[PDB]
Subunit: 289 residues, 3 copies
């Protein structure tokens, strides 16, 4: 069976003083198409493969291609995947929970470098033999994640730096906890990063959380992000503040809202301020198809 899913988003993206002779506000948009092929068996093993075609404003040649494949095999709550896989640090819960606005951006997200599902092709040739293996397992409210990524699998392994990651998250109805650790993140020798987060749903209406990170070799250093959101019917108000160890940095912060216009249609905006006093704002829509 083959199925297609995706989304489109378009809105205004404002960056204070982006550059000499550059408009500070443009229309930024993205079109995402996923192509999923799956084969189900009567033995309960589901085989799958996916491809992604993703277009973003400003993309080279004003064109769209697919990325590199991802294959998986699933059985009894376990999934093993190969090729362009989702990684542990990028898949755990809570780590992207302060993101806001129609581009789901946050300075309160982790300031480190690490591998992740590659949504598009890469013109530098750096991903040509990139190959990952990941394993996930969901023990009810408890998710476990494991990923190994070799940036160039054709070359003797002793000559390249492979990334190894693990994560686990857990949740009941009102508390969630999440943790992840990754060594040689992004193929960088000694770039070892970690994440621990916790969140509390202090209603059915509100949640507050805290994420801490060790950003490994990044200039940012350790980081803490405090975030919260509140739902008022169809609108959701979100806010966060984040600090890094880097000498002299400002405290990052942001405020935003999400309006659930209909199932599949969300209007979102945000005003944020970064660690180097960058001012960014957005307003747009996303629709899921």
């Amino acid at each position: 069976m083959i199925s297609l899913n995706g989304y489109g988003r378009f809105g205004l993206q404002y960056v204070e003083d982006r550059g000499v002779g550059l408009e500070d506000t443009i229309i930024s948009s993205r079109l995402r198409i996923n192509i999923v092929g799956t084969t189900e068996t009567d033995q309960g093993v589901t085989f799958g493969a996916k491809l992604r075609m993703q277009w973003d404003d400003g993309d080279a040649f004003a064109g769209t291609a697919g990325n590199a494949a991802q294959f998986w095999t699933s059985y009894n709550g376990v999934t093993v995947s190969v090729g362009n896989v989702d990684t542990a640090f990028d898949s755990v819960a809570l780590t992207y929970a302060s993101a806001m606005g129609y581009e789901a951006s946050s300075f309160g997200d982790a300031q480190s470098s690490f591998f992740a599902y590659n949504s598009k092709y890469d013109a530098s040739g750096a991903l040509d033999n990139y190959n990952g293996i990941a394993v996930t397992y969901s023990i009810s409210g408890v998710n476990l994640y494991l990923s190994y990524v070799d940036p160039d699998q054709t070359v003797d392994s002793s000559l390249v730096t492979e990334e190894f990651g693990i994560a686990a998250d857990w949740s009941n109805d009102m508390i969630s906890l999440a943790a992840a650790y990754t060594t040689d993140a992004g193929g960088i020798v000694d770039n070892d990063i970690a994440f621990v987060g916790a969140a509390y749903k202090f209603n059915d209406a509100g949640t507050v959380g805290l994420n801490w990170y060790d950003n490994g070799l990044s200039t940012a250093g350790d980081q803490v992000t405090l975030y919260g959101n509140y739902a008022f019917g169809a609108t959701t108000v979100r806010a966060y503040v984040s600090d890094i160890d880097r000498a002299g940095a400002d405290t990052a912060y942001g405020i935003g809202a999400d309006y659930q216009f209909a199932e599949g249609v969300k209007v979102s905006g945000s005003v944020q301020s970064g660690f180097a006093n960058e001012t960014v704002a957005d307003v747009g829509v996303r629709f899921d198809f």
Copy 2:
């Protein structure tokens, strides 16, 4: 929801004395696939996005990719679109009504340069930040069209030439009228073009029309095209003659036929002569899927 539609066409394309060591007749064909994603809401606002994958014989690398996206939002007869939009001068009725043959070509089409929906990627990089906004509105038999296209939206607007177009067409059962005007057409300062056309269905079987254009800065100058067609059951006979102001040009003309073989399947041929006495002929099929 995601849907796919398209067509394929293949036939012979003959160009008199195309060039030294070049075959005058080749097999020219095109494969077009549209990918449409739409999200409907109970509030009557439909959100949509589309992508196109188009292959033509002779295409670089013998490959196919998608073009840049187009997004739209529709409500009560109004449609607002963003990104790679259809423009006013290219979308009005009647302006392509003399086209014929399986490649739907005509020297009697407007001889100017202007922006239009870009069916493919562009290897020069000229379209990378091309961004348009269009608005259409259909007041029963009366269509209205508006388009604004900024060729590079990242750069201060004062430094680039934006294209602005408007058009309207109207039709009852037997007369149609259409008009369009576009300033700085194709991003060219002072390339201001206009179109006025009219057509008369003098039966349920025949139509005759006239299109006049101001081709702006083009070498062609003003132009007039007279065309007509007649349906004989499943066959349609078409003809046109066109003149331009350019000193010394020949009167362009063509004669063709369309055979409706089945719903979705059309066999078409044509013999045409251009403004510089070029001789072109074609014969082929198009099938819609």
Copy 3:
């Protein structure tokens, strides 16, 4: 109507002493998506077109695009195709019958150069104006095939070398016979190749066959391949031995097995040895969607 079909395959691919500083075993995988558009008519003529998007591990830019189109028209057992067609030597039965392993490889396949359906784009530009025409006709158990391929159809034909091929195969329930001949195979003046094969199903469980080839201008020279397979319930055991005329070559051979895990899911492995004593082995899965 538009339909999508394809498959995904992933496993281990081992090449003895592949190269200094190169891992002998990697994970090799392929994702194939076919896009088929067809238009049926009440007159019994079916029009079709297809496109292919194929990703293989190691592919340039870690991306995927479509290849060049293929169009066809079918009526009463006859199919005429244009553009990127299947050729006679590549489509006849039996010629790939000794292939084994999850990559369906065999040194016992023909050692010549010839044109074939191009599954992907080609970055050299060599396929840009490549255009073929093929005709197949199936007279019950008897298939006939014809293909003409012009590598650059825009240039006077006298200046290029066109490939012409024919083949026929025939089968009752227990014997199959197949033959093919192609002149100027692969666009190479005087590269004339031929194939004759025969196979005998000596049960409902076993088959043995022999293929002979004239590999035209190749260094290999004439070739003979002897192969056989036996089905044991859900497993199939295959073997082959092949010899070429090239002075000094080793006898090529291989042994493999296929496990039909479920409809659409096949686990396959193989150990093979080539003409220059290369050692290759594989083990993997293929799933059809």
